[PDB]
Protein backbone atom coordinates (compact mmCIF):
# COMPACT_ATOMS: atom_id res chain seq x y z
CA UNK A 1 0.00 0.00 0.00
CA UNK A 2 1.23 3.49 -0.67
CA UNK A 3 1.83 6.16 1.96
CA UNK A 4 -0.18 9.34 1.49
CA UNK A 5 0.66 12.67 3.11
CA UNK A 6 -2.08 15.28 2.74
CA UNK A 7 -1.74 18.89 3.90
CA UNK A 8 -3.98 21.96 4.01
CA UNK A 9 -2.27 25.35 3.71
CA UNK A 10 -4.10 28.42 4.98
CA UNK A 11 -3.97 31.64 2.93
CA UNK A 12 -1.02 33.99 3.28
CA UNK A 13 -1.06 37.67 4.21
CA UNK A 14 -0.13 38.76 0.68
CA UNK A 15 -3.26 37.23 -0.86
CA UNK A 16 -5.46 38.56 1.95
CA UNK A 17 -4.04 42.10 1.92
CA UNK A 18 -2.84 42.80 -1.63
CA UNK A 19 -5.56 40.85 -3.48
CA UNK A 20 -8.61 40.77 -1.13
CA UNK A 21 -8.67 36.98 -1.54
CA UNK A 22 -8.03 33.92 0.64
CA UNK A 23 -6.50 30.99 -1.25
CA UNK A 24 -6.51 27.60 0.47
CA UNK A 25 -4.14 24.98 -0.97
CA UNK A 26 -4.71 21.27 -0.32
CA UNK A 27 -2.14 18.83 -1.70
CA UNK A 28 -1.41 15.13 -1.23
CA UNK A 29 2.06 13.61 -1.59
CA UNK A 30 2.11 9.99 -2.69
CA UNK A 31 3.63 7.19 -4.71
CA UNK A 32 0.68 6.73 -7.09
CA UNK A 33 -1.91 9.53 -7.00
CA UNK A 34 -3.81 8.34 -10.09
CA UNK A 35 -7.14 7.53 -8.39
CA UNK A 36 -6.59 9.73 -5.31
CA UNK A 37 -8.77 12.82 -5.56
CA UNK A 38 -9.24 15.98 -3.51
CA UNK A 39 -12.73 17.33 -2.84
CA UNK A 40 -13.66 20.66 -1.26
CA UNK A 41 -16.34 21.93 1.11
CA UNK A 42 -16.89 25.58 2.09
CA UNK A 43 -19.12 25.81 5.18
CA UNK A 44 -20.34 22.28 4.47
CA UNK A 45 -21.35 22.94 0.85
CA UNK A 46 -19.53 21.88 -2.29
CA UNK A 47 -18.09 25.13 -3.71
CA UNK A 48 -19.92 26.92 -6.50
CA UNK A 49 -16.68 28.26 -7.98
CA UNK A 50 -13.14 29.22 -7.12
CA UNK A 51 -11.60 25.73 -7.20
CA UNK A 52 -8.66 25.27 -9.60
CA UNK A 53 -7.24 21.74 -9.47
CA UNK A 54 -3.50 21.50 -10.04
CA UNK A 55 -1.56 19.03 -12.15
CA UNK A 56 0.03 15.75 -11.11
CA UNK A 57 3.79 16.02 -10.59
CA UNK A 58 6.27 13.20 -10.97
CA UNK A 59 9.30 13.61 -8.72
CA UNK A 60 12.91 12.46 -8.99
CA UNK A 61 12.68 10.40 -5.79
CA UNK A 62 9.76 8.36 -7.18
CA UNK A 63 7.05 10.22 -5.26
CA UNK A 64 4.14 12.12 -6.79
CA UNK A 65 2.42 15.34 -5.76
CA UNK A 66 -0.98 16.72 -6.75
CA UNK A 67 -2.64 19.86 -5.41
CA UNK A 68 -5.93 21.74 -5.50
CA UNK A 69 -6.53 25.43 -4.80
CA UNK A 70 -9.64 27.15 -3.45
CA UNK A 71 -9.98 30.94 -3.43
CA UNK A 72 -12.45 32.72 -1.15
CA UNK A 73 -13.39 36.40 -1.01
CA UNK A 74 -11.64 38.00 1.95
CA UNK A 75 -15.08 38.85 3.36
CA UNK A 76 -15.79 35.13 3.76
CA UNK A 77 -12.41 34.76 5.48
CA UNK A 78 -12.84 37.53 8.06
CA UNK A 79 -16.36 36.22 8.71
CA UNK A 80 -14.92 32.92 9.95
CA UNK A 81 -15.99 30.59 7.14
CA UNK A 82 -15.12 26.89 7.34
CA UNK A 83 -13.02 25.29 4.59
CA UNK A 84 -12.77 21.49 4.49
CA UNK A 85 -10.58 19.54 2.06
CA UNK A 86 -11.00 15.78 1.68
CA UNK A 87 -8.60 13.17 0.30
CA UNK A 88 -10.41 10.20 -1.27
CA UNK A 89 -8.41 7.12 -2.29
CA UNK A 90 -10.07 3.72 -2.86
CA UNK A 91 -7.38 1.99 -0.75
CA UNK A 92 -7.80 4.23 2.33
CA UNK A 93 -10.62 5.72 4.40
CA UNK A 94 -11.28 9.40 3.64
CA UNK A 95 -8.92 11.95 5.18
CA UNK A 96 -10.41 15.38 5.90
CA UNK A 97 -8.46 18.52 6.79
CA UNK A 98 -10.17 21.67 8.03
CA UNK A 99 -9.29 25.36 8.33
CA UNK A 100 -11.90 27.03 10.53
CA UNK A 101 -12.06 29.86 13.03
CA UNK A 102 -11.43 28.25 16.38
CA UNK A 103 -13.76 29.12 19.28
CA UNK A 104 -10.81 28.61 21.65
CA UNK A 105 -8.69 31.05 19.60
CA UNK A 106 -8.01 34.62 20.72
CA UNK A 107 -7.78 37.39 18.14
CA UNK A 108 -4.72 39.66 18.23
CA UNK A 109 -5.99 42.61 20.26
CA UNK A 110 -3.49 45.32 19.31
CA UNK A 111 -0.74 45.85 16.74
CA UNK A 112 1.89 48.52 17.36
CA UNK A 113 4.31 50.05 14.85
CA UNK A 114 6.98 52.61 15.79
CA UNK A 115 10.62 53.40 15.02
CA UNK A 116 13.73 52.28 16.90
CA UNK A 117 16.89 53.75 15.34
CA UNK A 118 18.48 55.62 12.44
CA UNK A 119 19.29 53.28 7.87
CA UNK A 120 15.94 53.22 9.67
CA UNK A 121 14.73 50.27 11.73
CA UNK A 122 10.96 49.79 11.97
CA UNK A 123 9.51 47.64 14.76
CA UNK A 124 6.09 46.01 14.44
CA UNK A 125 4.59 44.40 17.54
CA UNK A 126 1.38 42.41 17.98
CA UNK A 127 0.17 40.91 21.25
CA UNK A 128 -2.68 39.05 22.89
CA UNK A 129 -3.33 36.17 20.50
CA UNK A 130 -3.46 32.36 20.60
CA UNK A 131 -2.64 29.87 18.98
CA UNK A 132 0.83 31.35 18.24
CA UNK A 133 0.77 30.74 14.47
CA UNK A 134 1.30 34.20 12.99
CA UNK A 135 2.01 35.68 9.56
CA UNK A 136 3.62 39.10 9.12
CA UNK A 137 4.27 41.23 6.03
CA UNK A 138 6.11 44.50 5.39
CA UNK A 139 5.21 47.01 2.69
CA UNK A 140 6.56 50.30 1.32
CA UNK A 141 3.92 52.42 -0.45
CA UNK A 142 1.68 49.44 -1.30
CA UNK A 143 4.73 47.43 -2.46
CA UNK A 144 5.99 44.42 -0.52
CA UNK A 145 9.33 44.43 1.31
CA UNK A 146 11.30 41.43 2.60
CA UNK A 147 14.33 42.91 4.39
CA UNK A 148 12.97 42.03 7.85
CA UNK A 149 13.88 39.89 10.84
CA UNK A 150 10.88 38.17 12.41
CA UNK A 151 10.82 36.91 15.99
CA UNK A 152 8.44 33.94 16.43
CA UNK A 153 5.62 34.02 18.94
CA UNK A 154 6.73 33.88 22.60
CA UNK A 155 4.64 33.79 25.83
CA UNK A 156 0.61 35.79 33.79
CA UNK A 157 -0.63 35.03 30.29
CA UNK A 158 -3.22 33.33 28.13
CA UNK A 159 -1.58 34.62 24.96
CA UNK A 160 1.58 35.05 22.88
CA UNK A 161 3.38 37.98 21.30
CA UNK A 162 5.73 38.45 18.36
CA UNK A 163 7.67 41.22 16.64
CA UNK A 164 9.56 41.83 13.41
CA UNK A 165 12.23 44.46 12.78
CA UNK A 166 12.48 45.97 9.29
CA UNK A 167 15.69 47.76 8.29
CA UNK A 168 15.39 50.09 5.30
CA UNK A 169 18.42 51.77 3.67
CA UNK A 170 19.00 55.46 4.27
CA UNK A 171 17.95 57.24 1.03
CA UNK A 172 11.36 60.81 -0.74
CA UNK A 173 9.15 60.29 2.33
CA UNK A 174 7.40 56.96 2.74
CA UNK A 175 4.67 55.36 4.84
CA UNK A 176 5.32 51.80 6.01
CA UNK A 177 2.47 49.39 6.68
CA UNK A 178 2.76 46.27 8.85
CA UNK A 179 0.12 43.61 8.15
CA UNK A 180 -0.41 40.58 10.40
CA UNK A 181 -2.88 37.76 9.75
CA UNK A 182 -3.80 35.37 12.54
CA UNK A 183 -5.42 32.47 10.74
CA UNK A 184 -7.14 30.44 13.48
CA UNK A 185 -8.78 33.68 14.66
CA UNK A 186 -9.42 35.16 11.23
CA UNK A 187 -8.06 38.64 11.99
CA UNK A 188 -6.05 40.80 9.61
CA UNK A 189 -4.31 43.64 11.40
CA UNK A 190 -2.58 46.44 9.54
CA UNK A 191 -0.88 49.62 10.73
CA UNK A 192 0.74 52.65 9.17
CA UNK A 193 3.61 54.78 10.43
CA UNK A 194 5.42 57.44 8.43
CA UNK A 195 8.90 58.92 8.23
CA UNK B 1 8.01 -9.14 -10.34
CA UNK B 2 9.08 -6.17 -8.20
CA UNK B 3 8.58 -2.41 -8.43
CA UNK B 4 10.76 0.13 -6.66
CA UNK B 5 9.57 2.56 -4.00
CA UNK B 6 9.89 6.29 -3.27
CA UNK B 7 13.11 6.81 -1.31
CA UNK B 8 14.25 10.25 -0.18
CA UNK B 9 17.67 10.75 1.43
CA UNK B 10 18.62 13.92 3.31
CA UNK B 11 21.64 15.20 5.24
CA UNK B 12 21.63 17.70 8.10
CA UNK B 13 24.74 19.67 9.00
CA UNK B 14 25.87 20.62 12.52
CA UNK B 15 24.14 23.45 14.38
CA UNK B 16 25.66 26.51 16.05
CA UNK B 17 24.75 25.30 19.55
CA UNK B 18 26.38 21.93 18.78
CA UNK B 19 29.69 23.49 17.73
CA UNK B 20 29.81 26.41 20.16
CA UNK B 21 28.52 24.69 23.31
CA UNK B 22 29.71 21.08 22.91
CA UNK B 23 32.67 21.36 20.48
CA UNK B 24 31.10 18.52 18.49
CA UNK B 25 29.88 18.55 14.88
CA UNK B 26 27.01 16.09 14.39
CA UNK B 27 25.94 15.30 10.81
CA UNK B 28 22.42 13.83 10.74
CA UNK B 29 21.65 11.78 7.63
CA UNK B 30 18.26 10.14 7.21
CA UNK B 31 16.08 8.58 4.52
CA UNK B 32 12.28 8.74 4.22
CA UNK B 33 10.50 5.91 2.46
CA UNK B 34 8.02 3.05 2.43
CA UNK B 35 10.07 -0.14 3.05
CA UNK B 36 13.44 0.83 4.54
CA UNK B 37 14.56 -2.62 5.74
CA UNK B 38 17.18 -2.97 2.96
CA UNK B 39 18.18 0.72 3.11
CA UNK B 40 21.54 1.18 4.85
CA UNK B 41 23.01 4.63 5.48
CA UNK B 42 26.81 4.51 5.39
CA UNK B 43 29.32 7.25 6.17
CA UNK B 44 32.66 8.45 4.83
CA UNK B 45 34.94 10.85 6.71
CA UNK B 46 37.69 12.49 4.63
CA UNK B 47 36.76 9.91 1.98
CA UNK B 48 37.30 6.88 4.25
CA UNK B 49 35.05 4.95 6.63
CA UNK B 50 34.90 6.38 10.18
CA UNK B 51 36.56 4.26 12.85
CA UNK B 52 33.80 5.04 15.34
CA UNK B 53 31.20 7.53 16.44
CA UNK B 54 28.18 6.56 14.30
CA UNK B 55 24.78 6.11 15.97
CA UNK B 56 22.44 4.23 13.65
CA UNK B 57 18.80 4.90 14.48
CA UNK B 58 15.69 2.81 14.99
CA UNK B 59 13.24 2.59 12.10
CA UNK B 60 10.70 5.37 12.62
CA UNK B 61 7.20 4.70 11.31
CA UNK B 62 4.80 7.59 10.73
CA UNK B 63 0.99 7.82 10.88
CA UNK B 64 0.84 8.28 7.07
CA UNK B 65 2.49 4.99 6.07
CA UNK B 66 5.98 6.49 5.74
CA UNK B 67 9.09 4.99 7.29
CA UNK B 68 12.16 6.97 8.36
CA UNK B 69 15.61 6.00 9.62
CA UNK B 70 18.36 8.39 10.69
CA UNK B 71 22.05 7.75 11.24
CA UNK B 72 24.14 10.49 12.84
CA UNK B 73 27.91 10.96 12.83
CA UNK B 74 29.50 13.16 15.50
CA UNK B 75 32.94 14.65 14.87
CA UNK B 76 35.24 16.91 16.91
CA UNK B 77 34.90 20.58 16.05
CA UNK B 78 38.54 20.55 14.94
CA UNK B 79 37.64 17.98 12.27
CA UNK B 80 34.74 20.16 11.13
CA UNK B 81 36.86 23.31 11.53
CA UNK B 82 39.58 21.74 9.36
CA UNK B 83 37.26 21.04 6.42
CA UNK B 84 36.92 17.27 6.68
CA UNK B 85 34.76 15.89 3.89
CA UNK B 86 31.62 14.17 5.22
CA UNK B 87 29.60 11.82 3.00
CA UNK B 88 26.36 9.88 3.47
CA UNK B 89 25.31 7.07 1.13
CA UNK B 90 21.99 5.25 0.70
CA UNK B 91 22.39 1.61 -0.37
CA UNK B 92 19.16 0.04 -1.57
CA UNK B 93 19.49 -3.17 -3.63
CA UNK B 94 17.39 -2.18 -6.66
CA UNK B 95 18.63 1.44 -6.60
CA UNK B 96 21.94 3.25 -7.14
CA UNK B 97 24.19 4.42 -4.30
CA UNK B 98 22.96 7.92 -3.44
CA UNK B 99 25.63 10.15 -1.91
CA UNK B 100 25.00 13.43 -0.07
CA UNK B 101 28.25 15.30 0.58
CA UNK B 102 28.88 17.87 3.32
CA UNK B 103 32.17 19.24 2.00
CA UNK B 104 34.04 22.46 2.57
CA UNK B 105 33.14 23.94 -0.81
CA UNK B 106 36.12 25.69 -2.46
CA UNK B 107 34.13 28.49 -4.14
CA UNK B 108 32.41 29.37 -0.83
CA UNK B 109 33.26 32.87 0.34
CA UNK B 110 33.68 32.90 4.11
CA UNK B 111 32.13 35.56 6.37
CA UNK B 112 34.42 38.59 6.34
CA UNK B 113 33.72 39.85 9.86
CA UNK B 114 31.04 39.93 12.55
CA UNK B 115 29.53 43.05 14.13
CA UNK B 116 27.68 43.42 17.43
CA UNK B 117 26.37 46.63 18.99
CA UNK B 118 23.19 48.16 20.45
CA UNK B 119 20.38 49.23 18.14
CA UNK B 120 18.05 50.92 20.63
CA UNK B 121 16.86 50.88 24.25
CA UNK B 122 11.10 48.44 29.10
CA UNK B 123 13.75 46.46 27.21
CA UNK B 124 16.86 46.83 25.07
CA UNK B 125 17.71 45.60 21.58
CA UNK B 126 20.98 44.23 20.19
CA UNK B 127 22.29 43.54 16.69
CA UNK B 128 24.43 40.93 14.98
CA UNK B 129 25.83 41.52 11.50
CA UNK B 130 27.55 38.88 9.36
CA UNK B 131 29.02 40.18 6.12
CA UNK B 132 30.49 39.01 2.83
CA UNK B 133 29.74 35.28 2.59
CA UNK B 134 28.28 32.87 0.04
CA UNK B 135 26.22 30.65 -0.13
CA UNK B 136 23.69 32.47 2.10
CA UNK B 137 23.10 29.30 4.14
CA UNK B 138 24.02 30.46 7.64
CA UNK B 139 22.98 29.83 11.24
CA UNK B 140 23.07 32.20 14.22
CA UNK B 141 22.84 31.93 18.00
CA UNK B 142 22.69 34.38 20.89
CA UNK B 143 24.13 33.68 24.34
CA UNK B 144 23.41 35.37 27.67
CA UNK B 145 26.71 34.67 29.47
CA UNK B 146 27.09 30.91 28.76
CA UNK B 147 23.30 30.49 28.40
CA UNK B 148 21.45 30.66 25.09
CA UNK B 149 18.77 33.33 24.65
CA UNK B 150 16.15 32.68 21.98
CA UNK B 151 14.41 36.09 21.82
CA UNK B 152 15.97 37.16 18.51
CA UNK B 153 14.49 38.26 15.23
CA UNK B 154 16.58 36.77 12.43
CA UNK B 155 16.69 38.23 8.91
CA UNK B 156 17.94 35.64 6.37
CA UNK B 157 20.37 36.76 3.71
CA UNK B 158 19.40 38.52 0.48
CA UNK B 159 21.77 39.39 -2.40
CA UNK B 160 28.95 39.02 -5.22
CA UNK B 161 28.16 38.03 -1.65
CA UNK B 162 25.41 38.01 0.99
CA UNK B 163 24.76 39.45 4.44
CA UNK B 164 22.29 38.68 7.22
CA UNK B 165 21.46 40.30 10.54
CA UNK B 166 19.63 39.37 13.73
CA UNK B 167 18.13 41.66 16.38
CA UNK B 168 18.04 40.33 19.95
CA UNK B 169 15.60 41.70 22.54
CA UNK B 170 16.85 41.74 26.13
CA UNK B 171 14.93 42.62 29.35
CA UNK B 172 25.74 40.71 31.16
CA UNK B 173 27.91 39.81 28.15
CA UNK B 174 25.90 39.03 25.01
CA UNK B 175 27.85 37.00 22.44
CA UNK B 176 26.60 36.40 18.90
CA UNK B 177 27.93 33.22 17.30
CA UNK B 178 27.70 32.63 13.54
CA UNK B 179 28.01 29.28 11.76
CA UNK B 180 28.63 29.20 8.01
CA UNK B 181 28.54 25.60 6.81
CA UNK B 182 29.97 25.71 3.29
CA UNK B 183 33.13 27.51 4.38
CA UNK B 184 33.59 25.72 7.72
CA UNK B 185 33.78 29.13 9.36
CA UNK B 186 32.64 30.10 12.84
CA UNK B 187 32.78 33.60 14.32
CA UNK B 188 31.80 35.10 17.66
CA UNK B 189 31.51 38.62 19.00
CA UNK B 190 30.79 40.02 22.47
CA UNK B 191 29.59 43.23 24.06
CA UNK B 192 28.91 45.08 27.32
C1 LIG C 1 4.60 11.27 6.31
O1 LIG C 1 4.85 12.12 7.42
C2 LIG C 1 6.25 12.17 7.76
C3 LIG C 1 6.35 13.00 9.02
O2 LIG C 1 6.62 14.36 8.72
C4 LIG C 1 7.04 12.75 6.59
O3 LIG C 1 8.43 12.70 6.91
C5 LIG C 1 9.02 13.95 6.50
O4 LIG C 1 9.49 13.85 5.16
C6 LIG C 1 10.01 15.09 4.65
C7 LIG C 1 10.43 14.82 3.23
O5 LIG C 1 10.61 16.03 2.50
C8 LIG C 1 11.17 15.59 5.52
O6 LIG C 1 11.47 16.91 5.10
C9 LIG C 1 12.88 17.12 4.96
O7 LIG C 1 13.47 17.48 6.21
C10 LIG C 1 14.85 17.84 6.13
C11 LIG C 1 15.40 18.03 7.53
O8 LIG C 1 14.34 17.86 8.47
C12 LIG C 1 14.76 18.44 9.72
O9 LIG C 1 13.88 19.47 10.11
C13 LIG C 1 12.52 19.08 10.31
C14 LIG C 1 11.76 20.34 10.64
O10 LIG C 1 12.31 20.82 11.87
C15 LIG C 1 11.55 21.93 12.38
O11 LIG C 1 10.21 21.54 12.69
C16 LIG C 1 10.06 20.58 13.77
C17 LIG C 1 8.57 20.29 13.92
O12 LIG C 1 8.31 19.01 13.35
C18 LIG C 1 10.68 21.17 15.04
O13 LIG C 1 10.56 20.23 16.10
C19 LIG C 1 12.16 21.47 14.78
O14 LIG C 1 12.77 21.95 15.97
C20 LIG C 1 12.31 22.46 13.62
O15 LIG C 1 11.76 23.69 14.09
C21 LIG C 1 12.46 18.06 11.45
O16 LIG C 1 11.12 17.60 11.60
C22 LIG C 1 13.40 16.86 11.20
O17 LIG C 1 13.46 16.07 12.38
C23 LIG C 1 13.08 14.70 12.10
O18 LIG C 1 14.16 13.99 11.55
C24 LIG C 1 15.35 13.91 12.37
C25 LIG C 1 16.37 13.12 11.60
O19 LIG C 1 15.75 11.91 11.17
C26 LIG C 1 15.00 13.26 13.72
O20 LIG C 1 16.13 13.31 14.57
C27 LIG C 1 13.83 14.01 14.38
O21 LIG C 1 13.48 13.40 15.62
C28 LIG C 1 12.63 14.09 13.44
O22 LIG C 1 12.19 12.74 13.27
C29 LIG C 1 14.81 17.31 10.78
O23 LIG C 1 15.44 17.75 11.99
C30 LIG C 1 14.95 19.11 5.28
O24 LIG C 1 16.29 19.58 5.27
C31 LIG C 1 14.46 18.78 3.86
O25 LIG C 1 14.54 19.93 3.03
C32 LIG C 1 15.67 19.79 2.13
O26 LIG C 1 15.31 19.06 0.97
C33 LIG C 1 14.32 19.69 0.12
C34 LIG C 1 14.05 18.74 -1.03
O27 LIG C 1 12.90 17.96 -0.70
C35 LIG C 1 14.85 21.05 -0.35
O28 LIG C 1 13.88 21.68 -1.16
C36 LIG C 1 15.17 21.92 0.86
O29 LIG C 1 15.65 23.20 0.44
C37 LIG C 1 16.16 21.23 1.79
O30 LIG C 1 17.40 21.19 1.09
C38 LIG C 1 18.46 21.20 2.07
O31 LIG C 1 19.03 19.90 2.20
C39 LIG C 1 19.66 19.36 1.00
C40 LIG C 1 20.27 18.02 1.38
O32 LIG C 1 19.22 17.07 1.55
C41 LIG C 1 20.70 20.35 0.45
O33 LIG C 1 21.21 19.88 -0.79
C42 LIG C 1 20.07 21.74 0.27
O34 LIG C 1 21.02 22.65 -0.25
C43 LIG C 1 19.50 22.21 1.59
O35 LIG C 1 20.61 22.19 2.46
C44 LIG C 1 20.72 23.41 3.21
O36 LIG C 1 20.56 23.15 4.56
C45 LIG C 1 21.35 22.05 5.07
C46 LIG C 1 21.16 22.02 6.57
O37 LIG C 1 21.11 20.66 7.00
C47 LIG C 1 22.86 22.17 4.66
O38 LIG C 1 23.43 20.88 4.68
C48 LIG C 1 23.06 22.77 3.24
O39 LIG C 1 24.42 23.16 3.07
C49 LIG C 1 22.11 23.92 2.98
O40 LIG C 1 22.46 24.91 3.94
C50 LIG C 1 13.04 18.23 3.88
O41 LIG C 1 12.18 19.32 4.18
C51 LIG C 1 10.80 15.61 7.00
O42 LIG C 1 11.96 15.86 7.79
C52 LIG C 1 10.18 14.29 7.43
N1 LIG C 1 9.75 14.35 8.82
C53 LIG C 1 10.18 13.49 9.75
C54 LIG C 1 9.63 13.69 11.13
O43 LIG C 1 10.97 12.59 9.49
C55 LIG C 1 6.77 11.98 5.31
O44 LIG C 1 7.35 12.65 4.19
C56 LIG C 1 5.27 11.83 5.07
N2 LIG C 1 5.02 10.98 3.91
C57 LIG C 1 4.35 11.40 2.83
C58 LIG C 1 4.19 10.40 1.73
O45 LIG C 1 3.91 12.54 2.74
C1 LIG D 1 10.14 13.34 -2.79
O1 LIG D 1 10.42 14.71 -3.05
C2 LIG D 1 9.27 15.56 -2.95
C3 LIG D 1 9.70 16.94 -3.37
O2 LIG D 1 10.69 17.47 -2.49
C4 LIG D 1 8.72 15.51 -1.52
O3 LIG D 1 7.54 16.29 -1.46
C5 LIG D 1 7.56 17.06 -0.24
O4 LIG D 1 7.03 16.28 0.83
C6 LIG D 1 7.09 16.96 2.09
C7 LIG D 1 6.65 15.96 3.14
O5 LIG D 1 5.66 16.49 4.00
C8 LIG D 1 6.23 18.22 2.05
O6 LIG D 1 6.43 18.93 3.27
C9 LIG D 1 5.24 19.59 3.72
O7 LIG D 1 5.17 20.93 3.23
C10 LIG D 1 4.06 21.69 3.73
C11 LIG D 1 4.00 23.03 3.01
O8 LIG D 1 4.93 23.02 1.93
C12 LIG D 1 5.02 24.37 1.43
O9 LIG D 1 6.36 24.82 1.48
C13 LIG D 1 7.27 24.06 0.69
C14 LIG D 1 8.67 24.54 1.02
O10 LIG D 1 8.60 25.93 1.33
C15 LIG D 1 6.90 24.25 -0.78
O11 LIG D 1 7.80 23.50 -1.58
C16 LIG D 1 5.45 23.79 -1.04
O12 LIG D 1 5.07 24.13 -2.37
C17 LIG D 1 5.01 22.95 -3.20
O13 LIG D 1 3.68 22.49 -3.30
C18 LIG D 1 2.74 23.43 -3.87
C19 LIG D 1 1.38 22.76 -3.86
O14 LIG D 1 1.45 21.64 -4.74
C20 LIG D 1 3.20 23.81 -5.29
O15 LIG D 1 2.33 24.79 -5.82
C21 LIG D 1 4.64 24.35 -5.25
O16 LIG D 1 5.07 24.68 -6.56
C22 LIG D 1 5.57 23.34 -4.58
O17 LIG D 1 5.61 22.22 -5.46
C23 LIG D 1 4.46 24.39 -0.03
O18 LIG D 1 4.20 25.72 -0.48
C24 LIG D 1 4.25 21.85 5.23
O19 LIG D 1 3.21 22.66 5.76
C25 LIG D 1 4.22 20.47 5.89
O20 LIG D 1 4.43 20.61 7.28
C26 LIG D 1 3.28 20.07 7.96
O21 LIG D 1 3.39 18.66 8.04
C27 LIG D 1 4.53 18.17 8.78
C28 LIG D 1 4.48 16.67 8.72
O22 LIG D 1 5.24 16.25 7.59
C29 LIG D 1 4.48 18.72 10.22
O23 LIG D 1 5.64 18.30 10.92
C30 LIG D 1 4.42 20.26 10.18
O24 LIG D 1 4.40 20.79 11.50
C31 LIG D 1 3.22 20.71 9.36
O25 LIG D 1 2.06 20.25 10.07
C32 LIG D 1 1.13 21.33 10.32
O26 LIG D 1 0.72 21.96 9.10
C33 LIG D 1 -0.10 21.18 8.19
C34 LIG D 1 -0.43 22.07 7.01
O27 LIG D 1 0.79 22.57 6.47
C35 LIG D 1 -1.34 20.64 8.92
O28 LIG D 1 -2.07 19.81 8.04
C36 LIG D 1 -0.90 19.84 10.15
O29 LIG D 1 -2.04 19.29 10.80
C37 LIG D 1 -0.08 20.72 11.08
O30 LIG D 1 -0.97 21.75 11.53
C38 LIG D 1 5.26 19.53 5.27
O31 LIG D 1 6.53 19.93 5.77
C39 LIG D 1 6.65 19.11 0.88
O32 LIG D 1 5.72 20.17 0.71
C40 LIG D 1 6.72 18.32 -0.43
N1 LIG D 1 7.27 19.14 -1.49
C41 LIG D 1 6.67 19.31 -2.68
C42 LIG D 1 7.38 20.19 -3.66
O33 LIG D 1 5.60 18.77 -2.94
C43 LIG D 1 8.42 14.07 -1.12
O34 LIG D 1 8.06 14.00 0.26
C44 LIG D 1 9.65 13.18 -1.35
N2 LIG D 1 9.33 11.79 -1.05
C45 LIG D 1 10.02 11.06 -0.17
C46 LIG D 1 9.56 9.65 0.01
O35 LIG D 1 10.96 11.52 0.46
C1 LIG E 1 -6.41 48.71 8.67
O1 LIG E 1 -7.69 48.26 8.31
C2 LIG E 1 -8.55 48.33 9.46
C3 LIG E 1 -9.80 47.55 9.17
O2 LIG E 1 -9.95 46.45 10.07
C4 LIG E 1 -8.79 49.79 9.85
O3 LIG E 1 -9.60 49.86 11.02
C5 LIG E 1 -7.46 50.50 10.09
O4 LIG E 1 -7.66 51.91 10.19
C6 LIG E 1 -6.46 50.21 8.96
N1 LIG E 1 -5.14 50.69 9.32
C7 LIG E 1 -4.60 51.81 8.83
C8 LIG E 1 -3.23 52.13 9.33
O5 LIG E 1 -5.20 52.52 8.04
C1 LIG F 1 35.36 33.39 20.61
O1 LIG F 1 35.45 32.78 21.90
C2 LIG F 1 36.70 32.10 22.12
C3 LIG F 1 36.60 31.42 23.47
O2 LIG F 1 35.72 32.12 24.34
C4 LIG F 1 37.86 33.09 22.03
O3 LIG F 1 39.08 32.38 22.15
C5 LIG F 1 37.82 33.85 20.71
O4 LIG F 1 38.81 34.87 20.71
C6 LIG F 1 36.44 34.46 20.48
N1 LIG F 1 36.37 35.10 19.17
C7 LIG F 1 36.93 36.29 18.90
C8 LIG F 1 36.76 36.79 17.50
O5 LIG F 1 37.55 36.92 19.75
Numbering used by the authors:
A (entry chain A): 294 to 411, 418 to 454, 459 to 474, 478 to 501
B (entry chain B): 291 to 411, 417 to 454, 461 to 472, 480 to 500
Sentences from the paper on this structure:
Humans produce five antibody isotypes (IgA, IgD, IgE, IgG, and IgM) as part of the adaptive immune response, each with different effector functions. IgD is the least well‐understood in terms of both its structure and function. Secreted IgD has been shown to recognize food proteins and respiratory bacteria and to bind and activate basophils in a manner that is proinflammatory but does not induce degranulation. Like the other human antibody isotypes, human IgD exists in both membrane‐bound (as part of the B‐cell receptor) and secreted forms.
We solved the crystal structure of human IgD‐Fc, with two molecules in the asymmetric unit, at 3.0 Å resolution. In the structure, molecule one comprises Chains A and B and molecule two comprises Chains C and D. IgD‐Fc is a homodimer and while the overall domain architecture resembles that for IgG‐ and IgA‐Fc, and the Cε3‐4 and Cμ3‐4 regions of IgE and IgM, respectively, there are substantial differences in the disposition of the domains that will be discussed in more detail below. The position of the Cδ2 domain relative to the Cδ3 domain is similar in each chain, and in each IgD‐Fc molecule, the Cδ2 domains contact one another, and the BC and DE loops and junction with the lower hinge form an interface that buries a surface area of ~255 Å2. The Cδ2 domain contains a high‐mannose oligosaccharide moiety covalently attached to Asn354 in the DE loop that was modeled in each chain as follows: Chains A and C, GlcNAc2Man4; Chain B, GlcNAc2Man7; and Chain D, GlcNAc2Man6. Although the Cδ3 domain dimer displays two‐fold symmetry, the relative orientation of the domains is markedly different to those in the other isotypes. When the CH3 and CH4 domain dimers are superposed on one of the domains, the second domain in IgD is rotated by ~35° relative to the second domain in the dimers. The buried surface area for the IgM Cμ4 interface is substantially lower at ~730 Å2 but that for the IgD Cδ3 interface is the lowest at ~640 Å2. One of the most notable differences at the Cδ3/Cδ3 interface is the absence of a stacking interaction between aromatic residues at the symmetry axis of the dimer. In IgD, the interface between the Cδ2 domain/Cδ2–Cδ3 domain linker and the Cδ3 domain is significantly larger at 922 Å2. Trp370 (Cδ2 domain EF loop) adopts a different rotamer in IgD compared with other isotypes, creating two pockets on each face of the aromatic ring that are almost reminiscent of a two‐pronged pocket.
